[PDB]
Design an enzyme around this catalytic site. Sequence first.
Site, PDB file in Angstrom:
ATOM      1  N   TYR A 149      13.054  -6.939  -0.321  1.00  0.00           N
ATOM      2  CA  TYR A 149      12.499  -6.396   0.883  1.00  0.00           C
ATOM      3  C   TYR A 149      10.940  -6.613   0.816  1.00  0.00           C
ATOM      4  CZ  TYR A 149      10.555  -3.120   4.223  1.00  0.00           C
ATOM      5  OH  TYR A 149       9.813  -2.614   5.344  1.00  0.00           O
ATOM      6  N   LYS A 203       8.180  -8.660   3.091  1.00  0.00           N
ATOM      7  CA  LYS A 203       6.897  -8.105   3.505  1.00  0.00           C
ATOM      8  C   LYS A 203       5.618  -8.788   3.014  1.00  0.00           C
ATOM      9  CE  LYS A 203       9.163  -5.785   6.361  1.00  0.00           C
ATOM     10  NZ  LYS A 203       9.031  -6.102   7.778  1.00  0.00           N
ATOM     11  N   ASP A 218      17.538 -13.573  19.668  1.00  0.00           N
ATOM     12  CA  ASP A 218      17.978 -13.360  18.335  1.00  0.00           C
ATOM     13  C   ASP A 218      17.036 -14.271  17.526  1.00  0.00           C
ATOM     14  OD1 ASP A 218      18.838 -13.829  16.002  1.00  0.00           O
ATOM     15  OD2 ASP A 218      20.998 -13.583  16.435  1.00  0.00           O
ATOM     16  N   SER A 241       4.504  -3.278   6.655  1.00  0.00           N
ATOM     17  CA  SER A 241       5.123  -2.289   5.881  1.00  0.00           C
ATOM     18  C   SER A 241       4.173  -2.024   4.676  1.00  0.00           C
ATOM     19  CB  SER A 241       6.458  -2.860   5.462  1.00  0.00           C
ATOM     20  OG  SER A 241       7.051  -2.142   4.342  1.00  0.00           O
TER      21      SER A 241
HETATM   22  N1  LIG Z   1      11.466   2.368   9.970  1.00  0.00           N
HETATM   23  C1  LIG Z   1      10.458   2.701   9.168  1.00  0.00           C
HETATM   24  O1  LIG Z   1      10.464   3.688   8.423  1.00  0.00           O
HETATM   25  C2  LIG Z   1       9.287   1.719   9.176  1.00  0.00           C
HETATM   26  C3  LIG Z   1       8.214   1.948   8.332  1.00  0.00           C
HETATM   27  C4  LIG Z   1       7.183   1.028   8.227  1.00  0.00           C
HETATM   28  C5  LIG Z   1       7.210  -0.144   8.970  1.00  0.00           C
HETATM   29  N2  LIG Z   1       8.293  -0.360   9.817  1.00  0.00           N
HETATM   30  C6  LIG Z   1       8.367  -1.686  10.423  1.00  0.00           C
HETATM   31  O2  LIG Z   1       8.716  -1.817  11.796  1.00  0.00           O
HETATM   32  C7  LIG Z   1       9.638  -2.889  11.998  1.00  0.00           C
HETATM   33  C8  LIG Z   1      10.840  -2.270  12.637  1.00  0.00           C
HETATM   34  O3  LIG Z   1      11.270  -0.968  12.176  1.00  0.00           O
HETATM   35  P1  LIG Z   1      11.726   0.260  13.158  1.00  0.00           P
HETATM   36  O4  LIG Z   1      13.126   0.667  12.847  1.00  0.00           O
HETATM   37  O5  LIG Z   1      10.711   1.324  13.085  1.00  0.00           O
HETATM   38  O6  LIG Z   1      11.712  -0.532  14.574  1.00  0.00           O
HETATM   39  P2  LIG Z   1      12.675  -1.585  15.316  1.00  0.00           P
HETATM   40  O7  LIG Z   1      11.977  -1.890  16.557  1.00  0.00           O
HETATM   41  O8  LIG Z   1      14.045  -0.987  15.389  1.00  0.00           O
HETATM   42  O9  LIG Z   1      12.815  -2.865  14.342  1.00  0.00           O
HETATM   43  C9  LIG Z   1      13.992  -3.114  13.560  1.00  0.00           C
HETATM   44  C10 LIG Z   1      14.658  -3.989  14.580  1.00  0.00           C
HETATM   45  O10 LIG Z   1      14.927  -5.327  14.201  1.00  0.00           O
HETATM   46  C11 LIG Z   1      15.813  -5.848  15.193  1.00  0.00           C
HETATM   47  N3  LIG Z   1      16.542  -6.996  14.654  1.00  0.00           N
HETATM   48  C12 LIG Z   1      17.421  -6.985  13.653  1.00  0.00           C
HETATM   49  N4  LIG Z   1      17.932  -8.223  13.522  1.00  0.00           N
HETATM   50  C13 LIG Z   1      17.370  -9.018  14.444  1.00  0.00           C
HETATM   51  C14 LIG Z   1      17.481 -10.385  14.827  1.00  0.00           C
HETATM   52  N5  LIG Z   1      18.289 -11.253  14.240  1.00  0.00           N
HETATM   53  N6  LIG Z   1      16.738 -10.857  15.845  1.00  0.00           N
HETATM   54  C15 LIG Z   1      15.898 -10.068  16.496  1.00  0.00           C
HETATM   55  N7  LIG Z   1      15.759  -8.785  16.179  1.00  0.00           N
HETATM   56  C16 LIG Z   1      16.476  -8.232  15.168  1.00  0.00           C
HETATM   57  C17 LIG Z   1      16.705  -4.703  15.728  1.00  0.00           C
HETATM   58  O11 LIG Z   1      17.044  -4.628  17.183  1.00  0.00           O
HETATM   59  P3  LIG Z   1      17.249  -5.696  18.133  1.00  0.00           P
HETATM   60  O12 LIG Z   1      18.581  -5.694  18.648  1.00  0.00           O
HETATM   61  O13 LIG Z   1      16.371  -5.437  19.077  1.00  0.00           O
HETATM   62  O14 LIG Z   1      16.972  -6.995  17.763  1.00  0.00           O
HETATM   63  C18 LIG Z   1      15.853  -3.480  15.364  1.00  0.00           C
HETATM   64  O15 LIG Z   1      15.431  -2.790  16.538  1.00  0.00           O
HETATM   65  C19 LIG Z   1       9.788  -3.646  10.671  1.00  0.00           C
HETATM   66  O16 LIG Z   1       9.243  -4.977  10.714  1.00  0.00           O
HETATM   67  C20 LIG Z   1       9.231  -2.643   9.653  1.00  0.00           C
HETATM   68  O17 LIG Z   1       8.333  -3.190   8.690  1.00  0.00           O
HETATM   69  C21 LIG Z   1       9.331   0.564   9.947  1.00  0.00           C
HETATM   70  C1  LIG Z   2       9.766   2.530   1.104  1.00  0.00           C
HETATM   71  C2  LIG Z   2       8.964   3.595   1.917  1.00  0.00           C
HETATM   72  C3  LIG Z   2       9.863   3.918   3.121  1.00  0.00           C
HETATM   73  C4  LIG Z   2      10.084   2.720   4.075  1.00  0.00           C
HETATM   74  C5  LIG Z   2       8.823   1.913   4.466  1.00  0.00           C
HETATM   75  O1  LIG Z   2       9.158   0.552   4.710  1.00  0.00           O
HETATM   76  C6  LIG Z   2       7.859   1.731   3.332  1.00  0.00           C
HETATM   77  C7  LIG Z   2       7.655   3.021   2.536  1.00  0.00           C
HETATM   78  C8  LIG Z   2       6.598   2.584   1.545  1.00  0.00           C
HETATM   79  C9  LIG Z   2       6.203   3.843   0.802  1.00  0.00           C
HETATM   80  C10 LIG Z   2       7.451   4.265   0.060  1.00  0.00           C
HETATM   81  C11 LIG Z   2       8.626   4.763   0.948  1.00  0.00           C
HETATM   82  C12 LIG Z   2       9.778   5.228   0.031  1.00  0.00           C
HETATM   83  C13 LIG Z   2       9.337   5.979  -1.252  1.00  0.00           C
HETATM   84  C14 LIG Z   2       8.054   5.504  -1.968  1.00  0.00           C
HETATM   85  C15 LIG Z   2       8.351   4.333  -2.871  1.00  0.00           C
HETATM   86  C16 LIG Z   2       7.149   6.499  -2.754  1.00  0.00           C
HETATM   87  O2  LIG Z   2       7.562   6.809  -4.066  1.00  0.00           O
HETATM   88  C17 LIG Z   2       5.725   5.952  -2.829  1.00  0.00           C
HETATM   89  C18 LIG Z   2       5.681   4.863  -1.728  1.00  0.00           C
HETATM   90  C19 LIG Z   2       6.964   5.232  -0.946  1.00  0.00           C
END
Ligand SMILES: NC(=O)c1ccc[n+]([C@@H]2O[C@H](COP(=O)([O-])OP(=O)(O)OC[C@H]3O[C@@H](n4cnc5c(N)ncnc54)[C@H](OP(=O)(O)O)[C@@H]3O)[C@@H](O)[C@H]2O)c1
Ligand SMILES: C[C@]12CC[C@H](O)C[C@@H]1CC[C@@H]1[C@@H]2CC[C@]2(C)[C@@H](O)CC[C@@H]12
Lengths: 278, 272
Positions: A155, A159, A65, A142
Amino acid sequence: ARTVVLITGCSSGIGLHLAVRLASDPSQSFKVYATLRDLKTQGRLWEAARALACPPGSLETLQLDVRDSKSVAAARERVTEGRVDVLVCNAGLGLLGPLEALGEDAVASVLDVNVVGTVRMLQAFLPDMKRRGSGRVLVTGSVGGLMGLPFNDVYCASKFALEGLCESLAVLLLPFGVHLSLIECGPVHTAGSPEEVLDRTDIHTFHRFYQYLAHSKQVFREAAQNPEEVAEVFLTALRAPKPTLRYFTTERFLPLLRMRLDDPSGSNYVTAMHREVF
Amino acid sequence: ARTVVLITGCSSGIGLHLAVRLASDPSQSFKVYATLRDLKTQGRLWEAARALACPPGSLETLQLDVRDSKSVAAARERVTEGRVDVLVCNAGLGLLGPLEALGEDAVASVLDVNVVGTVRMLQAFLPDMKRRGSGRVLVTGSVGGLMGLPFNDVYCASKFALEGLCESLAVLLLPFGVHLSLIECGPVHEVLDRTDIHTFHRFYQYLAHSKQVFREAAQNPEEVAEVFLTALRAPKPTLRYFTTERFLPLLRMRLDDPSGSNYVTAMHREVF
Ligand SMILES: NC(=O)c1ccc[n+]([C@@H]2O[C@H](COP(=O)([O-])OP(=O)(O)OC[C@H]3O[C@@H](n4cnc5c(N)ncnc54)[C@H](OP(=O)(O)O)[C@@H]3O)[C@@H](O)[C@H]2O)c1
Ligand SMILES: C[C@]12CC[C@H](O)C[C@@H]1CC[C@@H]1[C@@H]2CC[C@]2(C)[C@@H](O)CC[C@@H]12
Ligand SMILES: NC(=O)c1ccc[n+]([C@@H]2O[C@H](COP(=O)([O-])OP(=O)(O)OC[C@H]3O[C@@H](n4cnc5c(N)ncnc54)[C@H](OP(=O)(O)O)[C@@H]3O)[C@@H](O)[C@H]2O)c1
Ligand SMILES: C[C@]12CC[C@H](O)C[C@@H]1CC[C@@H]1[C@@H]2CC[C@]2(C)[C@@H](O)CC[C@@H]12
């Protein structure tokens, strides 16, 4: 005799699909320690891994954690092989809302899990990579860490803060042999309520959160990536002879973003991003 | 009649100097509530506002702990006029050292003062500015919030954090007539027992680099204040003001490589 990897937040989404992706590599190079908030949630990890034919011993789950120094030291302790080669800091949260309507404890959590969270790990794990003269650290970014987003102020803050912290060490790490790297994702798939919400803000702000909400649904529809497409790209940055500081999982936001960089006053960005949203 | 300014971290430096450039401008139009963690620290404010023939009721002081929101609420109750026109978020902290050398209450504490504190102020004062459809908020920034710096890993973490916080707000407020701005300042005038020995080496190498950097490039708070006044008299304000031009080559370079690794290679040699 393998590449030893350790990933946070592997119960779902990107951590998951990276864990199974790597344990099932046909190189059989990866010994992967997938760590998890709460191991009771480890079913999907192992349904995916079974499914994928991960040779045994090739994946292990550990508790961890990020909010807790102990847990972090305690997973450090359960590494067997005595070293990490890759460390992927992936756990993270979002926060969505009118700044004003946002709770000061939600703001605290976002900050702990996403910035300080990534501090503890690199605190516990960098020493020994610095010692060895070897290691790659990979860091889930992100698009929200590259340019500001309305209704994601806290958020975005968390980031930008990790882009901040990572760029700063990457400067310093460069002759230590450690190679830290941000993987930058737009929306990824396998992705409060309005009652309360008109209550904690003004009606024009509430109207515009709605526009905000409608436009980010369209964006999800159009532009979300599979987690698999995304973990593919963490593979690449760890394959790379000279890793760069950043990888993009997409070029889609690559124009709203050079717009940010071609103008440092930021007035082009704030006009362009506001039209694009509202 | 008068523009009501409310300043955080007025006990010295930037805040102190701006509080008294404002209370004491030949216009006589600013009315300035200069807030300080504690008042025990005020003699210099007051001496400085005396150095300067600040007229009475151009300057009240308050206490404001930015870590505590009730005190944010307390200092808000105390704008007599019932409206802030200009808000300056200035109260800040450093934290320099090797990342592993750092205390967990210090890290937490830098992020709660620099990022969360700024959030508590916007949450307290932007509502009223949106409702009116006017206001300036000026946030004191850094070049460490613009690019990454050896041994300030955690300090740049919170300055990058206010960039993206203020950029996100900026997009929402565009059409409210409410105007938020960042004045990006360059420099303004145990360890071993936590950290290895080639890390501990070059956290000299690094301080030798800032020392000769402050000396070629440092700016006083009176020069900084003039960006603050330049930004708040602008008709149609930008999101960022640069107190200086020294760093925008490194920064165009950081920009010119999204990828990141030029900037990292520039900056490494630069300092090592
Ligand atoms: N989802 C999207 O659309 C998206 C888009 C762009 C970038 N990302 C990036 O990818 C990362 C994860 O997103 P994801 O949903 O795609 O993958 P992910 O591997 O699910 O990462 C989110 C995770 O954070 C963990 N977490 C929450 N609280 C925690 C804590 N106290 N200690 C340790 N772990 C914790 C959760 O599971 P645990 O139980 O494993 O800890 C969960 O799996 C972020 O840093 C985010 O910027 C995601
Ligand atoms: C927030 C998201 C999704 C989760 C991920 O963490 C990051 C992206 C960034 C791009 C966002 C999108 C949501 C909608 C946005 C604001 C659009 O209008 C143009 C850029 C997009
Ligand atoms: N100093 C430089 O070289 C330099 C360079 C670039 C940018 N800046 C920027 O300017 C800002 C301030 O630096 P400065 O020294 O030049 O001016 P400053 O006005 O002294 O700001 C630092 C201040 O923060 C305040 N503060 C500390 N903890 C606080 C808390 N809990 N609540 C409220 N206020 C608190 C302090 O006095 P109070 O008692 O008043 O609260 C102190 O005055 C920062 O945000 C920084 O980025 C400074
Ligand atoms: C941390 C400081 C000071 C406080 C101010 O608020 C922010 C600046 C950023 C510019 C710094 C300077 C310290 C020295 C630095 C890190 C050199 O390496 C190159 C640029 C310099």
